[PDB]
């Protein structure tokens, strides 16, 4: 019987490619807390979640002592094979921090799979080893904007997020621009961060139904909370719109699909605090017949390969993932292959297949 | 016209004079941030909030890299005068962390009443300078319970607050106790912190019915996110129903109005992000004919000034902020006078009048 006895952390910052650039805030770098966990067995398991806090509220610092302090104490000592409780045990005492969460929860399953000599994706009960991802575009000026879609398509994407929402006016223009650049071929996706109201919302589905465009959802038009809002656009809605930030958990899960707010669930882990919560909320889904994608924020390619063999055992195809297009290649490709726009997992791997090396030992 | 031209922060703990323990945590103590704001002019402006982590989620950490490396830049260079646009620019930045936004938002107040050379209570409007508050119980069995309340009743104290949710049964066998113990002078207010479910809300309102006691309120008494079966209870029950945990904004306060949800919106600053948050739950409640009453974290004499302020400049009377009662005197005797139950707020003081600076070493 196999007990956790041992946890650290450590901060990781990544440098990115180009400046990311959110409603809120400007940044070259994302920032994660890793965590390690180990067994009175000697394997070790990690997990890595970013600090959004425009976002999920988390920051380095308060993770790192929601870890140490809060965490530990329930987790050093028990069997890892009561996960389940343990976690349940340590999560109520600690209301939101979802990517602490996150963390911990990842770190356990890296352990599960490494305890049965398998990947975590296999654990989960994946088969498929590759999956697809949208490219994201800033919001920016029509013009830059067209650039930036072209320069997508010419690396091979076909799926293309488009963040509107900064200016309804810009969002409203483009869509001329694009029925007149790009073929059905080019399967956009738009994400408003919530940042339309109802009245626009409707006006802008309106005018995409005005031309000959292959759009395949509308996400989160409106605030998070606004579930009215986003039930009266489902109902009003030609296109699939999706609930981001809406959902973060299961019982969110619950409300949007009481309250019929989407068509479609954007599950991250990131919100959902890790695996057995998105999982959850996956099953929720199905029942509903809701659908589900998955995203990510800004985070590490460690937490884009837990997200994808959470999709790959869900059976979710739909993915924004595109992260891995901001970073250094040699940061993952020890266990990714990212041949646009397909993210395929290495063969073989051990649990999740990175260690932290470089960071915790060197 | 002043400016903030600095902003640091210092960490408090303070010990409790006996154990406080609910039926989400137990606790001997209170971690807080204050923050502290220099005006240009010279003038210092503080806020105190606690760090709960199981109830808001802040954490002393979070805050003090929130107030100081997300918030201070918005902040600092920026007029006094400018504190609305400033603080709604500044609270985009970050999700949850109420705590942390509570800090900085009495720190505004404290320098908009010192600049206007009055207390924060004058400035907000208030016109009385006393409230009375309840005094709240520890989970535990009967008999300490009961010692626990007649403790209180010896020191002054008519309305009791007593947590359950921890054990159901002892929570059943305890009204048994409270009737023959007490008289209909004593008011009961039972507080569950999330921790019945549905049937035993309703099982425990009956068993209240079948005693012969005073009871004032039934306070959160289902899980934060279960508002349908807030609203089942609000409907069930004779007695007012009060969303503490399923309330900390207004956007939250008009879904439980929307629901039909309580009777009465317990509200904390620790939960609203401060004064300017609190007051728009506050009008929305009055429009729609729901009452509130201001309650408190386990959290230091700081905030109960503040929220004390707060809840006499909107006439609200019913309250719960005896933290007052757990720690030591000192720490609040250069601000208020606690003739227990009532808060009597000190004449003359300007801002809030906390004192922090002679006792706390606060660095940038
Ligand atoms: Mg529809
Ligand atoms: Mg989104």
Redesign the pocket.
């Given at each position: 019987v196999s007990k956790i006895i041992d946890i650290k952390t450590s901060i990781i910052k990544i440098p990115l490619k180009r400046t990311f650039i959110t409603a809120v805030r400007s940044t070259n770098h994302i920032d994660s807390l890793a965590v390690e966990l180990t067994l009175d067995n000697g394997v070790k398991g990690y997990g890595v979640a970013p600090a959004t806090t425009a976002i999920t509220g988390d920051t380095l610092q308060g993770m790192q002592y929601i870890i140490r302090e809060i965490f530990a104490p329930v987790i050093l000592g028990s069997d890892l094979s009561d996960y389940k409780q343990t976690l349940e045990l340590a999560f109520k005492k600690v209301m939101f921090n979802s990517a602490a969460k996150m963390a911990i929860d990842l770190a356990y399953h890296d352990l599960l799979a490494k305890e049965q000599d398998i990947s975590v994706a296999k654990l989960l009960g994946a088969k498929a080893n590759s999956i697809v991802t949208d490219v994201s575009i800033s919001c920016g000026n029509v013009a830059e904007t067209i650039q930036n879609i072209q320069n997508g398509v010419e690396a091979n994407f076909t799926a293309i997020k488009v963040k509107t929402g900064a200016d309804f006016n810009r969002d409203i223009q483009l869509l001329k621009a694009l029925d007149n650049e790009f073929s059905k071929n080019i399967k956009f996706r738009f994400d408003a961060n919530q940042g339309w109201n109802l009245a626009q919302t409707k006006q802008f589905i309106e005018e995409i139904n005005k031309y000959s465009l292959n759009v395949e959802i509308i996400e989160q038009p409106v605030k998070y909370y606004d579930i009215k809002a986003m039930a009266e656009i489902?109902?009003f809605?030609?296109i699939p719109?999706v609930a981001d930030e809406s959902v973060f958990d299961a019982k969110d899960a619950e409300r949007v699909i009481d309250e019929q707010a989407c068509?479609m669930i954007n599950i991250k882990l990131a919100k959902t605090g890790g695996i057995l919560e998105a999982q959850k909320i996956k099953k929720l889904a199905d029942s509903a017949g809701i659908s589900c994608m998955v995203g990510c924020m800004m985070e590490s390619p460690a937490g884009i390969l837990a997200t994808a063999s959470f999709a790959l055992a869900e059976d979710i195809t739909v993915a924004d993932l595109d992260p891995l297009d901001w970073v250094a290649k040699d940061l993952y490709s020890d266990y990714i292959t990212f041949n646009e726009p397909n993210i395929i997992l290495k063969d073989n791997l051990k649990g999740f297949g990175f260690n932290l090396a470089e960071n915790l030992y060197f």
């Open positions: 489902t109902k809605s030609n719109v068509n």
